[PDB]
């Protein structure tokens with residue numbers, strides 16, 4: 001009675017969306033309906049392709065009259081299961097209702113019941129005991145062929161549920177649907193453009209719609225092309241009407257759609273703002289103010305970022321893939337960590353020392369089948385989806401199992417890593433930086449000779465033994481971090497001294513160190529083979545330790561006014577504490 | 581949260597599939613944006629298109645309080661949707677939307693709250709605001725590609741250090757009144 | 770497993 005809705009009547013008032021294109025798909029349905037056997041068609045497809053619009057659009061075509069004479073007289077009906085089950089409290093309510101509706105179909109002989117999500121009725125209508133499901137009830141009538149119906153289901157649902165019921169499948173004739181071509185999509189948007197133009201009181205340009213389909217497929221990877229494009233067109237109109245001005249930008253021009261796709265995809269948009277331009281230009285020295293030396297490494301990171309934001313970048317690869325190798329204590333990781341801070345983007349860290357076993361690597365791409373925990377999905381896929389624009393740090397990659405390489409090989413080549421669940425992660429805007437200590441032993445090794453020789457060349461051979469040529473060939477660059485020079489150490493000392501002052505500022509203590517004392521700390525702690533970590537120990541032994549005793553129990557409870565200076569006679573620093 | 585709200589309102593103003601889905605980790609403030617929208621409305625600092633709009637929060641427990649008989653849950657759920665469709669100036673904030681996937685089902689019944697809400701979401705008659713964590717959205721909500729397609733995901737990101745202090749200052753009077761205390765500026769930082 | 774059954778009272 002009220003469960004069924006006459007789609008044709010809805011078409012008269014314009015509620016139904018007019019179907020555009022899909023001429024071939026329509027033919028198959030009409031042909032299936034007309035044949036003697038297998039009268040019921042099944043529109044299999046994917047979510048958003050437009051399988052429902054075809055059925056709803058078929059009725060619209062019938063009222064318009066652009067269909068064969070045989071189908072012109074037909075009246076398509078649509079069943080709402082929720083209304084059918086709303087009042088089926090007593091015994092026999094569902095059976096009498098469904099059976100009553102079926103009688104109407106057979107007497108007419110020309111109506112079609114378009115039921116979407118046909119898989120749902122497989123187990124619906126029978127709570128327990130009776131087991132009188134709608135699928136079983138309709139089955140006999142389908143055998144004769146008196147009633148013809150149209151179904152809709154997805155591939156996964158059809159195989160998992162619908163295929164199980166061989167009886168129903170035998171009656172229905174499967175139809176394979178696929179997303180339309182980009183050429184067909186633009187025509188669909190133009191046909192549907194008046195509907196959205198009136199609702200939003202805006203005029204969409206023909207150039208903008210073409211950009212929407214092209215830009216959406218390039219960045220939006222979680223939906224099919226027809227619905228995906230419409231989502232960018234509907235939001236665009238919504239954005240324009242919400243402007244504070246009284247619809248000044250009535251027309252939807254180009255470069256406005258770019259904002260919507262960028263916002264939906266959570267990626268940087270084109271026409272970079274002055275703030276971003278200043279941030280990228282200023283990021284030539286700001287990194288050099290925290291990581292001294294290794295200028296060639298910083299340039300590689302900034303160029304990849306500058307290229308991608310400029311618009312010149314790899315079509316399917318990431319912004320950049322780098323392998324940071326070198327001696328201990330150099331800024332292989334610090335330069336990466338400070339990069340994320342300078343850019344204001346989340347830093348994704350992955351200590352590869354925990355992924356040294358094959359079972360653990362399976363957790364990155366997805367979750368093991370055995371686990372029944374609801375927290376499925378991989379650690380790397382989930383993180384990337386949460387922060388598409390981010391820095392991915394794979395520290396000590398050499399420790400990880402070789403299987404990890406198979407994951408990165410498809411990332412640097414394709415840019416996407418599908419998880420076990422099926423979610424699609426885009427690595428286009430994510431920076432890829434992996435550090436390693438392959439050949440580090442050679443760097444600290446001393447030769448058997450009067451002159452110590454440079455074992456950097458030999459260390460590279462070890463890197464070529466762990467990382468296959470295909471892996472290195474896909475890397476954008478393979479940077480080698482040079483050893484810290486004496487001049488550089490003086491800059492490193494100032495960096496640690498500043499950090500010390502910050503810690504002291506929280507306690508209201510001020511520290512002033514003479515240049516002579518700073519130079520003395522460098523000569524004691526300078527070790528080319530052991531990088532800059534030894535310098536930290538020197539700062540702890542000569543500056544932190546004398547003050548820790550004074551801070552806890554001493555004059556330096558508050559105020560500070562400390563003064564450190566060198567004693568040339570004994571080459572030892574003299575500490576002066578003021579109680580303030 | 582001016583940027584996040586601007587997108588949520590944009591989604592709600594859409595002709596079709598005007599159902600936002602505020603996603604983010606726990607504590608970011610996803611429920612602060614849904615409930616906050618109401619507070620922002622009553623204050624009067626909102627676009628005229630959103631004014632006079634009513635936001636209703638759904639309690640799934642109350643919905644299934646007495647749905648013992650067959651079809652009772654379907655009637656109650658459908659009755660609520662009819663009210664939203666009739667007014668055309670109301671929204672339904674469903675928190676923990678992963679729960680509505682399977683709410684009322686038979687021994688083998690595929691029918692659930694998601695199947696009933698699905699047709700009206702696509703039509704656009706009713707607007708629905710969702711809020712769920714990243715873990716639940718990817719392992720529960722994203723499994724049903726049909727229900728997710730209708731919802732427009734909005735990623736709520738953790739705020740910066742400076743943004744949070746402003747939030748505490750905004751909420752400082754409420755907490756101060758409950759404890760009859762005063763918080764200094766140094767404490768917040 | 771743990772399945773919920775909806776009863777039907779007689780008319």
Ligand SMILES: Nc1ncnc2c1ncn2[C@@H]1O[C@H](COP(=O)(O)OP(=O)(O)OP(O)(O)=S)[C@@H](O)[C@H]1O
Nearest residue numbers: 018019020022047048049050051052053226227726
């Ligand atoms: N040929 C078309 N003409 C007009 N609109 C179309 C066409 N194809 C797709 N659309 C639009 O795309 C939307 C999504 O396609 P539908 O067939 O409605 O999806 P659906 O089968 O309900 O999706 P699920 O529930 O995810 S399987 C339609 O509702 C229309 O808005």
Ligand SMILES: Nc1ncnc2c1ncn2[C@@H]1O[C@H](COP(=O)(O)OP(=O)(O)OP(O)(O)=S)[C@@H](O)[C@H]1O
Nearest residue numbers: 290291292328329330331332333334436437492532
């Ligand atoms: N070039 C540098 N400039 C300034 N500080 C540095 C530099 N290199 C290292 N440091 C300091 O040393 C620490 C950073 O060492 P990292 O860069 O993390 O070492 P690494 O490259 O990961 O070495 P491994 O452990 O052998 S892979 C911090 O305390 C930094 O302040």
Ligand SMILES: Nc1ncnc2c1ncn2[C@@H]1O[C@H](COP(=O)(O)OP(=O)(O)OP(O)(O)=S)[C@@H](O)[C@H]1O
Nearest residue numbers: 581604605606607608609610611612712713747751
């Ligand atoms: N933007 C904000 N402005 C003001 N207060 C906020 C804001 N975000 C969060 N809060 C406060 O922080 C509290 C905790 O955040 P929640 O509202 O619980 O976040 P949530 O994302 O809804 O949490 P889950 O995901 O449901 S566990 C809020 O209830 C507010 O008191």
Ligand SMILES: [Mg+2]
Nearest residue numbers: 052116152702
């Ligand atoms: Mg549908």
Ligand SMILES: [Mg+2]
Nearest residue numbers: 332333395435
């Ligand atoms: Mg490191």
Ligand SMILES: [Mg+2]
Nearest residue numbers: 610611675711
């Ligand atoms: Mg919440």
